[PDB]
Amino acid sequence: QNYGINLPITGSMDTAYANSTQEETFLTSTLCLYYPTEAATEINDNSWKDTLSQLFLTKGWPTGSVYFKEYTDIASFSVDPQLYCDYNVVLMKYDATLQLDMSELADLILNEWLCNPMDITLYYYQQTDEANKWISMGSSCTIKVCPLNTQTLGIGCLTTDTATFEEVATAEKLVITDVVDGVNHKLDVTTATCTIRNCKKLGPRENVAVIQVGGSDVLDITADPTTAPQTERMMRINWKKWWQVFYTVVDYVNQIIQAMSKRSRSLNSAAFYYRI
Amino acid sequence: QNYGINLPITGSMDTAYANSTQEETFLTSTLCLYYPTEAATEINDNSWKDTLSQLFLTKGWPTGSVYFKEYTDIASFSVDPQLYCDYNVVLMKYDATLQLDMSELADLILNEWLCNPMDITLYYYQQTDEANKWISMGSSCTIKVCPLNTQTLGIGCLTTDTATFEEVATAEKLVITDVVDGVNHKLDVTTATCTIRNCKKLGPRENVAVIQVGGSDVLDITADPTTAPQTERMMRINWKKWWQVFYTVVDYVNQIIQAMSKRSRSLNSAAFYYRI
Amino acid sequence: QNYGINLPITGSMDTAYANSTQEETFLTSTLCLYYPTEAATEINDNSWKDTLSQLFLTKGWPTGSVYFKEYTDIASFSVDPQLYCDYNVVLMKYDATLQLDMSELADLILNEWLCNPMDITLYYYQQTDEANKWISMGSSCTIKVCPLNTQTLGIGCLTTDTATFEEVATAEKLVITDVVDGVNHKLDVTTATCTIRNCKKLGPRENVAVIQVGGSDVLDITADPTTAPQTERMMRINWKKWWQVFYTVVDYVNQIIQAMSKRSRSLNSAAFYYRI
Amino acid sequence: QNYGINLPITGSMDTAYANSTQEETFLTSTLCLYYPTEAATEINDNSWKDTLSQLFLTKGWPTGSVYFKEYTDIASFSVDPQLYCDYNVVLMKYDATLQLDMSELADLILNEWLCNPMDITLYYYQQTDEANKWISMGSSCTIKVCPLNTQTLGIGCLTTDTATFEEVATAEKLVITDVVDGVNHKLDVTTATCTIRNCKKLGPRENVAVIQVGGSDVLDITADPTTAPQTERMMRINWKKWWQVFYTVVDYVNQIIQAMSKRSRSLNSAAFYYRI
Amino acid sequence: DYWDDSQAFRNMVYVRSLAANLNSVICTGGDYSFALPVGQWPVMTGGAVSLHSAGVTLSTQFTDFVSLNSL
Ligand SMILES: *[C@@H]1O[C@H](CO)[C@@H](O)[C@H](O)[C@H]1NC(C)=O
Ligand SMILES: *[C@@H]1O[C@H](CO)[C@@H](O)[C@H](O)[C@H]1NC(C)=O
Ligand SMILES: *[C@@H]1O[C@H](CO)[C@@H](O)[C@H](O)[C@H]1NC(C)=O
Ligand SMILES: *[C@@H]1O[C@H](CO)[C@@H](O)[C@H](O)[C@H]1NC(C)=O
Ligand SMILES: [Ca+2]
Ligand SMILES: [Ca+2]
Ligand SMILES: [Ca+2]
Ligand SMILES: [Ca+2]
Ligand SMILES: [Ca+2]
Ligand SMILES: [Ca+2]
Ligand SMILES: [Ca+2]
Ligand SMILES: [Ca+2]
Ligand SMILES: [Ca+2]
Ligand SMILES: [Ca+2]
Ligand SMILES: [Ca+2]
Ligand SMILES: [Ca+2]
Ligand SMILES: [Ca+2]
Ligand SMILES: [Ca+2]
Ligand SMILES: [Ca+2]
Ligand SMILES: [Ca+2]
């Protein structure tokens, strides 16, 4: 394919449509439901996963294609999230105090990323293009940045005294840092508690759909202030009980996955491609 | 540009040969050496990594392109190995007692694997075809299997009574289980200290080479008894000193890289096939 | 001959085959059978040489053609081995702990070598070509190598403190060292006991065939990790008694010689051609 | 490139003489001087080797190309002398009492001898043609020969009693034995103290010249009584002071080398004839 | 500071790219006795320091006879 990637593909606008592929797609795919711990707590049942599997089977999924990956909360789930199935549906519980963390998680898992190691103890780092960011995740990530100048001297900070650096993130499980492009920054991070990578946003993921349970539209998966694109893969529902949420997900799984596309699952389950 | 489709590529049998790209490949690519801890212990030199980097620079690798990753032993390294460099060379010491462990390690790193989750509690699992295996990794993997019949009842085993299960792995750091295809199996796995995945062998991993330091050819990266292929990426060297081993690796790095190719799954052409 | 060495030789593809020259070759050649001392010990007979000569005569070798030379073990025989007659068959007993020593002896005696003196106390030395090696042999060789930089000082080793050198051999009766090409190395060698020479591998040696008695395919007569050739002159057999081994050698002497070629013998029995 | 085949050469006249190659050969070759210890004793200078090297450099030999090898006396030098330089000049002191020994030494180093092993304990031996001799060398050789008849019975000797054998050498460090051809001889040799070999005289050795210091023309390098050839490689000089001898050698190095030729056998053309 | 009569020191007035290698050694302290007028004689015995190589530079040896440019 690689030797024909840069080759045209011609199609005739009269070609007959193929039959529905939803049945065959479900019979050959895997579905992963990511839900918070409080969901299972409120449900308070040990066989609920089996019942959800049976209900999905009523919807056309063979027994063995639906998987359920519990996570404690948004912050913990944001530390190297792993996407295992062909289709990933992440149920994020909305909290008014964690809008930025929800946006960061959605940006991480709704977009492809190409990341490289950052030895912040030895070299200064820039952000070349609007697609370049610094994604740092771990148990507790605190990032301090001192922008330098053409002479390699800190601006508004001392290159040798970290106490003068600028705070952009304090005790973050995950944080995406955007700084002024073309400016060299000296970084100090709690490398013993988190890892920071220079990442590039390649495009959408197309196999991860984030359903926001409650709240309003607050997600912002683009660092550009003048854009808040509400894509088809970021859904929102209102709730009083988790069983209704799960029944809605099961009954409308056809619509949920019609908004997603296969062929995007990476060989590795990581949320970002990594190069060293 | 056309990523989700396979387009045939036509080439003339007399066009030309482009100049050697080895120098550019070394300049723009990273090298990783994976060696056991006992190698470093025997070398007993603090700056030996710097000397090896200098020698690689003499061979044309820019400083900082070559990385040296330590692992305690074959069993420990087999726990979810992560080979992130452009070119990976793994020096694997031969132990006559760990033939199958080395075979499993090489099969895991010398091949490309597409793995889906396994939830042994809910679902019974088959192996669809010859390329389907069950790869389990962890601090201690113990896998017992109960084959069922068309009526879901175990054969030589009781589903309720796990004591009657047939043990196929015991305290393994990594194991690739192969059972009869087309037969449903109830699995008992120590999920606390071991994760099992349903994996498909897509094909060779081009950018990973294994140099066996020691005994004869024992590796078998194929579950089929009738075939035990020895690919060009499975090197073998007799040794008495680790400095000799590393000097041989550096002096013939051109040939080692020649036996390897860029990971077909790690370049833009693989986009929307599985990964990048 | 010599002036016409660089002249074409033209042959028709219809020239009738000449008769078998095996009989004439045996009637005018001399055969050497190198065996370990333990072989003679286990045979426990003082006339076995006469019996073997008579059996070879039954196989066509005139009385006086075959010769028998005894060596204590691989380590001792590796000290400047001498190949005396037209056809040399070396019976090498296999030991799993001496794989590299067997490989080194096989490399030395199965290939032509062009060696030169190395005054390690005066000059630092380089290995220009992949064919260039450092062959050292004697009572006990301990070679310590210190790579040097443009200033001729040491890299990761003090040029004066031999304790900081890098150890490639210890108490070796024979060792073939291969350092990274193009780097000047200071060599500390136990010159009082053993001698080191800068050697160039010219090509294969047709008059020497090594029969490995027991074991597996472990010989690696080429320093290149990517290649482990098994030439027609490297035989392997399984044994329980030495009389069976010698009967096998006598019975299939025609096949053994067929794997060997004439004109490869030199006036001197040395294992290399020495230039000073 | 075509090795092992005797291709004719069809040169012509009027091809014009090439320029002198003497300077290039001196630049690219090495010279070995073999002299007795009494020479150094009489010279009584610790830097005489350096002065001779400087004088040879005045004659065109690059510094370090001339090697000065020393031997105790003729008998010690007749213990398998090794002449490895491109050009070898042996300053041999004349002694009326060691005439034959002198000749033998010359015969050993002024001629090419293809030697194969001799196992007197196991086989009987005969000299096939006039070029076949028995060369024995070591600490002390004592060869006793018992000629046999067609009934494999000793002639004037008993095959079982070595006291009746006929002595041809006694305490010799080198002896060349010529017996009647076509007759099998039983041999009693001090194999513990010295080694005997069956040697065929292929032809002259051109890189070795012998300068007889003082005396008369006594050398006889051919076993034929009817021939005593004084080849151009056998010089004779009358002497009183060794310094004059060495000055004569260095001054007429042009003439001495002109009397010699590159060893026809030791060069690339002789590949697959006997060496290189 | 070391100086030599070799060609490397004949006109050493300007030096660049100066580098060196040196193996460590041990200097052990000996016994020195004090000549007290009366009574027992104290002795200072022992004391060892291992000398390890450090940076090399350029110096000058100024003796009553020769002024040398040394390393
Ligand atoms: C597609 O659907 C049509 C309409 O039911 C059916 O006749 C046909 O067999 C199906 N398959 C194909 C390949 O057209
Ligand atoms: C390739 O190598 C040739 C031979 O040196 C050279 O002329 C040419 O410029 C090189 N580059 C290309 C792109 O052909
Ligand atoms: C070769 O063999 C043939 C057939 O046996 C025989 O006639 C002939 O004399 C032999 N020798 C030569 C030189 O052809
Ligand atoms: C040979 O010698 C002549 C005269 O000494 C000189 O002119 C010429 O350049 C030399 N070389 C050749 C190849 O003729
Ligand atoms: Ca955050
Ligand atoms: Ca500040
Ligand atoms: Ca930016
Ligand atoms: Ca935005
Ligand atoms: Ca059972
Ligand atoms: Ca295992
Ligand atoms: Ca199977
Ligand atoms: Ca197999
Ligand atoms: Ca060895
Ligand atoms: Ca060192
Ligand atoms: Ca080399
Ligand atoms: Ca090899
Ligand atoms: Ca003699
Ligand atoms: Ca007698
Ligand atoms: Ca004779
Ligand atoms: Ca004569």
Q: How many CB atoms lie within 10 A of CB B253?
A: 23
- Distance, in Å, from the CA atom of B273 to the CA atom of A4, rounded to the nearest integer, reads 13
The reply to whether C258 sits in an annotated binding site is: no
| DSSP three-state, residue B242 | helix
Q: Give the C-alpha separation, B210 to B219, whole Å.
A: 10
Quote the distance between the C-alpha of residue C94 and its chain's center: 15
**A7 closest CB neighbour out of B2, B114, B264:** B2
Residues contacting A201, CB < 8 A, separation 6+: A111, A112, A113, A131, A133
Give the residue among A114, A120, A106 at the shortest CA–CA distance from A273: A114
Please provide the DSSP assignment of B184-240 as one string. -EEEEE-TTS-EEEEEEEEEE-TTEEEEEESSS------S-TT-----TTEEEE--S
* Cα separation, B106 vs B129, whole angstroms: 21
Measured distance CA(C53)–CA(C62) in Å, rounded: 8
Q: At which residue do the structure tokens 């230039």 appear? A: C275
- Residue A17 one-letter amino acid: Y
∠ CA C247-C253-C255, rounded to 5°:
125
Both tokens of E59, joined, read 């110096």
CA distance linking residue C241 with residue C220, whole number of Å: 26
CA separation for the pair C243, C265 (Å, rounded):
28
D2 contacts C7 by C-beta, under 8 angstroms: yes
Could you say which of B236, B248, B256 has the minimum Cβ distance to residue C228? B236
| Number of Cβ within a 10 Å radius of residue B45 | 17
What are the distances in angstroms from CA D274 to CA A2, B253, C263, C270? 55, 36, 6, 12
Based on DSSP, count helices (H) and strands (E) in chain A, helices before strands: 7, 11
| D209, β-bridge pairs | D89
> Which runs of E-coded beta strand occur in D73-190?
87-93, 111-117, 132-141, 144-147, 166-167, 172-177, 185-188
Please judge whether B1 and A6 are an interchain contact, meaning their C-beta atoms are less than 8 angstroms apart. Answer: yes
Query: Which among A22, A89, A81 is positioned nearest to A52, based on CA atoms?
Result: A89
Q: Which residue of B has its CA nearest to A6?
A: B1
Pairwise CA distance, residues B126 & B181, whole Å: 6
Q: SS3 of C23, please?
A: helix
SS3 content of chain E, % helix, strand, coil (to 5): 5, 30, 70
Chains E and B touch (3+ CB pairs under 8 A): no
Chain C residue with the nearest C-alpha to that of D87: C276
Name the DSSP letter for residue C80: S
**H or E element at residue A243:** helix A242-251
Q: For residue C88, give how far its alpha carbon lies from the nearest alpha carbon of chain D (Å).
A: 12
Beta bridge partners of A36: A71
How long, in residues, is chain A? 276
Residue D31 contacts residue D86 (beta carbons within 8 Å): yes
Question: B89: part of which helix (H) or strand (E)?
Answer: strand B87-93
DSSP assignment string, C221-236: -SS-TT-----TTEEE
Contacts with C180 from chain B: Cβ below 8 Å? 55, 58-59, 247, 250-251
A45 CA to centre of own chain: 29
Dist CA A242 CA A91 (whole Å): 10
**Enclosing H/E stretch for B135:** strand B132-147
At D117, phi and psi to the nearest 5?
-70, 160
**Inter-axis angle of helices C242-251 and C48-58, nearest 10:** 30
Q: 3-state SS of chain A: helix, strand, coil percent to 5?
A: 25, 30, 45
Sign of CA dihedral D41, D47, D51, D57: positive
Beta strands in chain C, from DSSP E residues, in sequence order: 31-36, 66-71, 87-93, 111-117, 132-141, 143-147, 166-167, 172-177, 185-189, 194-204, 208-213, 234-237, 273-274
Do C167 and B238 count as a contact with CB atoms less than 8 A apart?
no
Query: Is residue D5 classed as helix, strand or coil in its secondary structure?
Result: coil
Q: Which amino acid belongs to residue D42?
A: E
Are residues B177 and B209 in contact, defined by beta-carbon separation less than 8 angstroms?
no
Can you list the pairs that A220-229 forms with residues at least 24 positions away whose Cβ atoms lie under 8 Å? A220/A103, A221/A103, A221/A106, A221/A107, A221/A110, A221/A111, A222/A107, A223/A130, A223/A133, A223/A176, A223/A178, A224/A130
| C235 beta partners | C211
| Nearest listed ligand to the Cα of residue B154 | 9
Which residues in chain E are closer than 8 Å to C160, comparing Cβ atoms? 21-23
Report helix, strand or coil for C219: coil
Gyration radius of chain E over CA positions: 19
Chains C and A share 3 or more Cβ pairs within 8 Å: no
- CB C18 within 8 Å of CB C11: no
Q: In terms of C-beta density within 10 A (0-12 exposed, 13-18 middle, 19 or more buried), how is residue C8 classed?
A: exposed
Residue owning tokens 């073990």: C73
What is the CA B19 to chain-centroid distance, rounded? Answer: 32
D22 φ, ψ to 5°? -65, -45
User: A67 and B265: CB-CB below 8 Å?
Assistant: no
Are A60 and A23 within 8 A, CB to CB? yes
Token pair in block for residue D213: 């210091």
Whether A134 and A179 have beta carbons less than 8 Å apart is answered as: yes
E24 vs C contacts (CB less than 8 Å): 161
Closest C-alpha to C102, from C199, C175, C2 = C175
Instruction: For Cα atoms A58, A60, A66, give the angle at the middle one, nearest 5 degrees.
Output: 90
Sole residue written with tokens 């006036």: C267
Return residues with CB closer than 5 A to ligand 11 (ion): B 127, 178, 181
CA–CA separation, D134 and D137 (whole Å): 10
Q: Give every strand in the sheet of C166-167, ordered side by side.
A: C166-167, C143-147, C185-189
**CB C221 within 8 Å of CB C112:** no
Q: What's the distance, Cα to Cα, between the start and end of chain E in Å?
A: 5
Q: How far is D96 from chain C (nearest CA, A)?
A: 32
DSSP state of C162: G
Chain E residues in contact with C158 by the CB 8 A cut-off are: 21-23, 53
Q: Would you tell me which residues 83-102 of chain C have a C-beta closer than 8 angstroms to some C-beta of chain D?
A: 84-86
How buried is D67 (Cβ within 10 angstroms: 0-12 exposed, 13-18 middle, 19+ buried)?
A: middle
Q: Pick from A254, A272, A212, A274: which is nearest to A87 by CA?
A: A254
Please report where in the chains the tokens 């859904």 appear, as a residue: A235
CB distance C113 to C202 below 8 Å: yes
Q: How far is C-alpha D216 from the geometric centre of its chain's CA atoms? A: 19
Q: What separation in angstroms does the CA of A75 have from each of A216, B53, D17?
A: 19, 40, 92
Residues of chain D numbered 171-210 and touching chain C (CB < 8 Å): 202
3-state DSSP call for residue D69? strand
| Method for this entry | cryo-EM
CB within 8 Å: B243 and C168: yes
For residue B209, how many other CB atoms are within 10 A of its CB? 23
Strand C87-93 to C208-213 pairing: parallel
Name the nearest CA neighbour of A205 among A136, A274, A109: A109
> Where on the phi/psi map is residue C138: left (φ > 0), alpha (ψ -120 to 50), or beta?
left
Chain centre distance of CA C61 = 25
Query: Which is nearest to A132 in space by CA: A94, A85, A176?
Result: A176
- Tokens standing for residue E23: 């193996």
How far does residue A97's CA lie from ligand 7's centre (Å)? Answer: 25
CB C171 within 8 A of CB C140: yes
State how far the Cα of E41 lies from the Cα of A166, in Å rounded to an integer.
69
Q: Nearest by CB to D112, from C4, C267, C275: name it.
A: C267
Q: Resolution of the deposited coordinates, in angstroms?
A: 2.7
For residues D142-157, b (16+ Cβ closer than 10 Å) or e, as one string? bbbbbbbeeeeebeeb
Distance CA B103, CA B176 (A): 10
* Shortest alpha-carbon distance between residue A65 and chain B (Å): 9
**Residue located via tokens 């630092």:** C124
Residues forming a β-bridge with D88: D32, D208
* Cα–Cα distance for residue pair A200/A185, rounded to 1 Å: 17
Contacts of the segment D148-157: beta carbons below 8 A, 24+ positions apart: D148/D124, D148/D183, D148/D184, D148/D185, D148/D186, D152/D124, D152/D184, D154/D186, D157/D186
**Sign, Cα dihedral of D1, D6, D12, D15:** positive
Continuous H helices in chain C: 22-27, 37-43, 48-58, 74-77, 99-110, 242-251, 253-258
Ligand nearest to the CA of B161: 9
CB B101 within 8 A of CB B255: no
What is the residue-wise DSSP string for A65-94? Answer: SEEEEEES-HHHHTSS-B--SSEEEEEEEP
Evaluate whether chains D and B are touching (3 or more beta carbon pairs less than 8 Å apart). Answer: no
Here the contacts of A97-105 (C-beta below 8 Å, separation 24 or greater) are: A98/A74, A99/A218, A101/A74, A101/A75, A101/A173, A101/A174, A102/A74, A102/A212, A102/A218, A102/A219, A103/A218, A103/A219, A103/A220, A103/A221, A104/A78, A104/A174, A104/A175, A104/A176, A105/A74, A105/A77, A105/A78, A105/A81, A105/A174, A105/A210
CA of C231 to the centre of ligand 16 (A): 13
Tokens 């918070």, residue located: A36
Q: For residue C9, what is the nearest residue in chain D, using CA coordinates?
A: D2
Sole residue written with tokens 């050493």:
E12
Show the CA angle centred on residue D176, arms to residues D170 and D178, nearest 5°. Answer: 105
Candidates B47, B243, B256; nearest CB to C225: B256
> How far is it, in rounded angstroms, from Cα B77 to Cα B270?
27
Q: Hey, how many other C-beta atoms are within 10 angstroms of the C-beta on C275?
A: 17
Which of A116, D267, A155, C186 is CA-nearest to residue B30? A116
Cα torsion for D122, D127, D128, D131, to the nearest 10°?
A: 130
